[PDB]
Each structure stands twice: as structure tokens, then as C-alpha cells.
Write a protein that binds this DNA or RNA. Structure first.
Length: 597
DNA sequence: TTTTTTTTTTTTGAGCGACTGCACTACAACGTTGTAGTGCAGTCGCTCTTTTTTTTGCTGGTGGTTTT
């Protein structure tokens, strides 16, 4: 890539410290490995290092041995920095892929967790089928949620892959209801994990409103899960040290663990969660397959769910047909039966069907760009609009359409109404941009919207006050004392006691906080796609820059499409949207070779 | 080029010198035994200051703060 050529000083200093007085081949390999680990690639194949490097004949002529060091494996193993996994070396080369020692340890831990410990819990099939028939009312055709709940309650470790609006939380509620109704006398300490606090709050309110609907008992309501915790808070991560409370000696005293949003879970946090689990806990992972990658280096959920396209096994198809009582198809071939059995694919979306163009566009994002052009082209399904953004008049037209997007918000702001309706009207329309600074970014679009509200008589703003009535703010760091998490929106207005910011709590109430008590506050007229994950908006509008950037890729446009409930607008060029679909954010990892053997 | 989380403390005196108890042999009183002197080991008090010393250019010299 363009960023991969501009070498960071960290990779150069790491290569000069690790290699030192060794050959320049080890220096170039360590620099390329550190640069690929900085971008998020877990493994480094030796074929790319051999072919796509111009210094390869130079390093071939620099080495001098009896065997001449023609292979990269002998040249790396001749140095004291690369071993086969026995000596405590920083770099590990085992399967013709060079990685770091920590990444190799976490990759082998994930492969051992998903290849060996995932055994089959044998339960009664008749009572499970009766609970699935009494919980799921649809029994006429094939329902993927029933098969997902059956394959999650059958095996210990299970991964549920599904997009937004497909009823994943209802599937988790039916799964937990059948889990408690199956084991009556056995105690079940259900635990819920989330990577972020706002997604944890959404998970708590969604599972509460899903489990209060289903009929339970007096002892069944006692075994309701209490709360969803952060992954740093469940394992006991400290700010100063990396020492965990449940690292390797005492595991977490849990029975079943549901980890929501596994797409934002990186490889070290996944390995630290795996090392904390006991030998009897059953873990259910949630997340989308085609969603955006993790925050730090690593891609766990994508490399897990890459084998979901092959299908199930021959025996597992008959097992699912005996459990669900319907016709479950089988997958052709068998490469890894445990991982292909533990996976599932959700295709039937309940909040949107084939009549809406949003789901068809989300299905056409993973396909070629001409499928997306055909999806936007014919009749637009009264849901998706596309506006070309090339010059300043297109920018003025985009701001004019954003005026109509925030029209109900400004109407409720000018009419001096209750703040709850103001927050409910603001949570229906949302702009999503890629970058932060410049003319195309967060700070550009926020300042342009503030200048446009200063121009037209819609929002009065004092230049020296910085806390005018009607500014939307968002928090950047968590604050458990105030009850607000990262990614929560607040609207500043004057109720009569002064300019205070109202936040919409997930418990149904509204909280008025002083702006002096806010730890962080950033203007949120246009959110980044990485920071808008977990939330949902009724009318989303994606804005992509004209300059080519590695942020705008297939998963970014997919998360921008799946962010919209009903209406979605686009402001991008044709060439940028055509090139962003083909350029997929691939992350090289050794999971595809370890799961194939 | 984007971005995630997190609130639990800990530990710290040792050498010098005496008190007391049990073992251990030397030697005189009545072969054996009681009294005396010393060695070794467990247990315990105790105790660890005091303080102040200065040259630096007021504007030393074409120097000089502030409004359009």
C-alpha cells in the first residue's frame, strides 16, 4: 500500500534493535513484519517478501554460506532472532509465515480453542425440540434463528453470524429461554460481554425488553442475566499494569457467556478471554461476518466465519433435521468439521425484506460493483438516493439536503418543546464521514454545518461562549460515575435553569448534566464510521472524500449501508465507490492454514 | 488512517547484651550422689542528636513594550 511504503520509525528501530549486526535480510523482514503488524496483519507470507521486494537479489548476494541461503527459511533460521517455536525468540516461523512471538502464541491459542476444546454437549433432543417449537411460533418453512439456537445450545463453542435487523437479540433471548427451560434443576450463571460500554447498555436494554416478554417462572426470573460487562472489566484489566484478576490461575465463575459484537474483538483480547475460560463454560459469539475489522491488530471473527460459505457436515445436517424438525441443507466436502459445525449464517432479515433496497444493496456490496450500480439504478426502491459530490455547488446541495435531514430537529428546537422529542428527532438522521480533518472529515463538516447555521437564521451562536443552545455533543471517554458511555449523544439547551446538556439514558429517562461536568465533548453533526458502530439510525447519509484513502473500503461502505434503517443517502464519486468495493481490507493470518489441518 | 477500554493494596529493624532454662562434667560428702561452674539455646529490652555559611553589573551608556 501507500502507507506500507512510508516506513514508520517504530518498525525501523525494531529492525535495528532485533537484527542489529545480522544480515540486511533479517532487518528487512523484521521491518516488514512490524509494518504489517502495525496495519493489522497477523502473519507475513514469505512469498510476498520474496517477490514484492526489490532488495531480494541484494540480500541474496549479501549472505555467504555453503548452501548459499537460497530459501528464506534457512536464512531466517540461521539468525538468532527467528526460531521454530522452541527458543524464546521475538520472531516465529513455523508454516512458511513469519510472525511475532506474541502473535504466534495468540494464534495458536485461538486455533487450540477453536479446534480441540470445542466438544459436543449431549442433551435431550425431544425436550429441546419441544422448547424450540413452543418458543419459535414459525414452523412452516426454514427459519435460520431456530437452527442457530439449536446449534448454539448443542455445541459448547458456537459463532452466530448475522447482520443488523435480522433479529439477533431475539435469537439470543430464545436461546437463553430454551437454555433455562432445558436445565431446570441445574444452576445457570449467564454472563454477557461487550467490547464497548454503549453496546453493553444497548445489549442490557434489548435483552431486558426481550426477556420480559417471554413467560417465565419464579425461579426462572431469578436466573435472569444481571448486566453486560466490558471485556476489560470482566477480566479485570488495570490502567497501569496488564495484570488481570482472572488471567491464568482462577477462571471466571460462569456457566454460559454471550459475547456480543465479536467483530470489534482483536486477537490479544480474544486470547486473554480464551485463557480466562474454564473447561465447562459455553461461549456464544455474536457479530456480523462482513462487518468492519477490529480496533487493534487482528481479525478473529472474519477468519472464523470465512468457512461459513462451505456449509455444515453430513452428520450435522441430520442432527439439525432431528432437532429443528425441518429440512436443513448439508455442505459439500469436509475440511474442518468442528468449525463448520459451530458456525451459522443468518439470511432472513425481519426488519427489512426484498422489497427494500437497503438489504439488496448490502447483499450487493459483497458482490461486484456493477451489482451495486444496478441496485441503485433501477427505480431506487424509494429508499436509497445517490448525489454526486465533485464541486462546491454539490457541497451546497449536500448542505441543503442535510437541512431537510435535520428539519424536524430544528423545528422542535425552535418551537421550544420537551428535550425527549428533540433527542428522538435527532436520532433519526445522521451523517457518516470517513476522515477527521480537512474539507472532508469530522472537524470540516461540523465547522461547515456550524457556519451554515450561522449564515441562515436557524441556530443562534455566540462566538465566545462555545456552549450555544442546540449543539450536539458526544463523549469520548467512559465515565461510570455520570452513567454515560463512549459514543453517547447529548443535546445542549436551556430548560430555564441554564444551558445544560440532556442525555437519553437507555433506562427510559433523560438526564440533564452541566457542561462543566462533561469529561469529553466533541461535535457530532457527522460521525466517523468506526465510532458509529453499534448504534442505529433511521436516515443515514454517507459522505466519502474525493481523494483515495485506505479507510474507504468494502467493509466501511457495508457498515455505512447497514447503519441505515429505512433511508440512505450517498455523496461520493462513481470511481471511488467502484474502487472501494473491489479493494477489500484483507488481513493475512495463519488461521486459514491451522484450521485446514 | 481509523480507534477500545480499566479502578484493587501490599512492605518495611537488627546488632548488642542480658534473663532464664536445661544439659554436662568436676569434685567433695556420705561405689554412689548432691552441689557448683560453664555451654548452648530460646526469649526479650533497647535504641538509633545537635546546623549554617552568597558575587550576580536598577538605566554598563547607538540603551527605550504594545498600535496600526
Amino acid at each position: 500500500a501507500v502507507e506500507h511504503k512510508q516506513l514508520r520509525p517504530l518498525d525501523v528501530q525494531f529492525a535495528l534493535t532485533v537484527a542489529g549486526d545480522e544480515h540486511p535480510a533479517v532487518t528487512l523482514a523484521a521491518a516488514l513484519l512490524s509494518h504489517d503488524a502495525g496495519e493489522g496483519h497477523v502473519c507475513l507470507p514469505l512469498s510476498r517478501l520474496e517477490n514484492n521486494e526489490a532488495s531480494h537479489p541484494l540480500l541474496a548476494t549479501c549472505v555467504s554460506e555453503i548452501g548459499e541461503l537460497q530459501n528464506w527459511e534457512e536464512c531466517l533460521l540461521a539468525s538468532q532472532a527467528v526460531s521454530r517455536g522452541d527458543e524464546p525468540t521475538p520472531m516465529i516461523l513455523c508454516g512458511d509465515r513469519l510472525y511475532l512471538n506474541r502473535m504466534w502464541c495468540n494464534e495458536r491459542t485461538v486455533a487450540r480453542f477453536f479446534n480441540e476444546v470445542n466438544h459436543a454437549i449431549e442433551v435431550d433432543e425431544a425436550l429441546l425440540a419441544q422448547t424450540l417449537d413452543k418458543l419459535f411460533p414459525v414452523s412452516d418453512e426454514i427459519n435460520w434463528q431456530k437452527v442457530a439456537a439449536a446449534v448454539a445450545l448443542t455445541r459448547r463453542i458456537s459463532v452466530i453470524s448475522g447482520g443488523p435487523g435480522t433479529g439477533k437479540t431475539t435469537t439470543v433471548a430464545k436461546l437463553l429461554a430454551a437454555l433455562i427451560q432445558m436445565a431446570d434443576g441445574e444452576r445457570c450463571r449467564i454472563r454477557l460481554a461487550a467490547p464497548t460500554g454503549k453496546a453493553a447498555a444497548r445489549l442490557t436494554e434489548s435483552l431486558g425488553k426481550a426477556l420480559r416478554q417471554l413467560p417465565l417462572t419464579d425461579e426462572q426470573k431469578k436466573r435472569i442475566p444481571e448486566d453486560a460487562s466490558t471485556l476489560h472489566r470482566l477480566l479485570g484489566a488495570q490502567p497501569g499494569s496488564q495484570r488481570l484478576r482472572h488471567h491464568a490461575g482462577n477462571p471466571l465463575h460462569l456457566d454460559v457467556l454471550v459475547v456480543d459484537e465479536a467483530s470489534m474483538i482483536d486477537l490479544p483480547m480474544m486470547s486473554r478471554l480464551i485463557d480466562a475460560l474454564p473447561d465447562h463454560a459455553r461461549v456464544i459469539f455474536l457479530g456480523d461476518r462482513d462487518q468492519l475489522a477490529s480496533v487493534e491488530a487482528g481479525a478473529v471473527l472474519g477468519d472464523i466465519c470465512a468457512y461459513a460459505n462451505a456449509g455444515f457436515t453430513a452428520e450435522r445436517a441430520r442432527q439439525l433435521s432431528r432437532l429443528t424438525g425441518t429440512h436443513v441443507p448439508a455442505g459439500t466436502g469436509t475440511e474442518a468439521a468442528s468449525l463448520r459445525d459451530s458456525l451459522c449464517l443468518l439470511q432472513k432479515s425481519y426488519r427489512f425484506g426484498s422489497d427494500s433496497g437497503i438489504g439488496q444493496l448490502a447483499a450487493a456490496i459483497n458482490r461486484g460493483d456493477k451489482t451495486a450500480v444496478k441496485t441503485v439504478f433501477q427505480q431506487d426502491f424509494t429508499d436509497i438516493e445517490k448525489r454526486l459530490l465533485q464541486s462546491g455547488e454539490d457541497y451546497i446541495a449536500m448542505l441543503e439536503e442535510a437541512l431537510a435531514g435535520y428539519g424536524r430537529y430544528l423545528d422542535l428546537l425552535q418551537a421550544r418543546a420537551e428535550p425527549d422529542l428533540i433527542i428522538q428527532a435527532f436520532n433519526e438522521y445522521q451523517l457518516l464521514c470517513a476522515l477527521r480533518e480537512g474539507p472532508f472529515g469530522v472537524a470540516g463538516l461540523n465547522e461547515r454545518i456550524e457556519q451554515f447555521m450561522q449564515q441562515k437564521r436557524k441556530i443562534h451562536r455566540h462566538p465566545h461562549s462555545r456552549w450555544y443552545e442546540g449543539r450536539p455533543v458526544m463523549i469520548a471517554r467512559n465515565d461510570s460515575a455520570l452513567g454515560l458511555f463512549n459514543g453517547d449523544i447529548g443535546i445542549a439547551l436551556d430548560r430555564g435553569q441554564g444551558t445544560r446538556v440532556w442525555f437519553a439514558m437507555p433506562d427510559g429517562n433523560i438526564k440533564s448534566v452541566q457542561p462543566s461536568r462533561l469529561p469529553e465533548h466533541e461535535t457530532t453533526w457527522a460521525m466517523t464510521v468506526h465510532k458509529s458502530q453499534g448504534s442505529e439510525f433511521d436516515h443515514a447519509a454517507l459522505i466519502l472524500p474525493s481523494q483515495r484513502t485506505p479507510v474507504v473500503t468494502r467493509e466501511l461502505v457495508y457498515t455505512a449501508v447497514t447503519r441505515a434503517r429505512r433511508r440512505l443517502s450517498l455523496y461520493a464519486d462513481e470511481r471511488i465507490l467502484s474502487a472501494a468495493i473491489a479493494t477489500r481490507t484483507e488481513r493475512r493470518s495463519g488461521l486459514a492454514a491451522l484450521f485446514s489441518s
